[PDB]
Swiss-Prot record, chain A:
It comes from Bacillus amyloliquefaciens (Bacillus velezensis). It comes from the Bacteria. CDD domains: Barstar. This is Barstar. One of its GO terms (cellular component) is cytoplasm.
UniProtKB/Swiss-Prot annotation, chain B:
This is Ribonuclease. The active site is at E71, H100. It is found in: Secreted. Transmembrane segments: none annotated. It comes from Bacillus amyloliquefaciens. The lineage of its organism: Bacteria, Bacillati, Bacillota, Bacilli, Bacillales. GO terms for cellular component: extracellular region. GO terms for molecular function: RNA binding; RNA endonuclease activity. Hydrolyzes phosphodiester bonds in RNA, poly- and oligoribonucleotides resulting in 3'-nucleoside monophosphates via 2',3'-cyclophosphate intermediates. Keywords: Endonuclease, Genetically modified food, Hydrolase, Nuclease, Secreted, Signal. It comes from the Bacteria.
Amino acid sequence: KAVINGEQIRSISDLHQTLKKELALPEYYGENLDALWDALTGWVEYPLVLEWRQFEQCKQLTENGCESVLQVFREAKAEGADITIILS
Amino acid sequence: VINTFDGVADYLQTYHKLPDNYITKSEAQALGWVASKGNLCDVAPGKSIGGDIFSNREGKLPGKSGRTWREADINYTCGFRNSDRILYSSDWLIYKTTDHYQTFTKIR
């Protein structure tokens, strides 16, 4: 079970570092969309539940990339990874 | 096994397929692979993950609509997966990453 407290996310790099800790990603985790795909399909433990709270605050960040991160989770689920996504 | 950057690159350029010691994520899962248990060699001894479509999500590799990219693990000898990958296109460009897809370098 992994929680992203969107109110506390200050940048896309912060988002990747939080995912790294919450999902126990490898120390070498590349903090990019290709690294995230690889970790979600060939590293993480299942069943995986990601609760992303206040995704809307990520959208307010100057950097783009919030929807792209969510999209990788959704594509990994579509690929067959046992992932559940909660947008709260 | 053939599992080094130059080993797999040379083999790909010569035979237009990965060496026999590669299996895709889905094929591995069908055999009982559980990535979080690091158990690929228990269900497929001597194998490495490779051959899956690589979607080039950061756009770092040169792309065009008629070109498909694929990826394969490099330097894997069982256990948890590492940070090393070879990337190869349908027109036989070959790149490598040693930093979990952060940077790529052309090798063929």
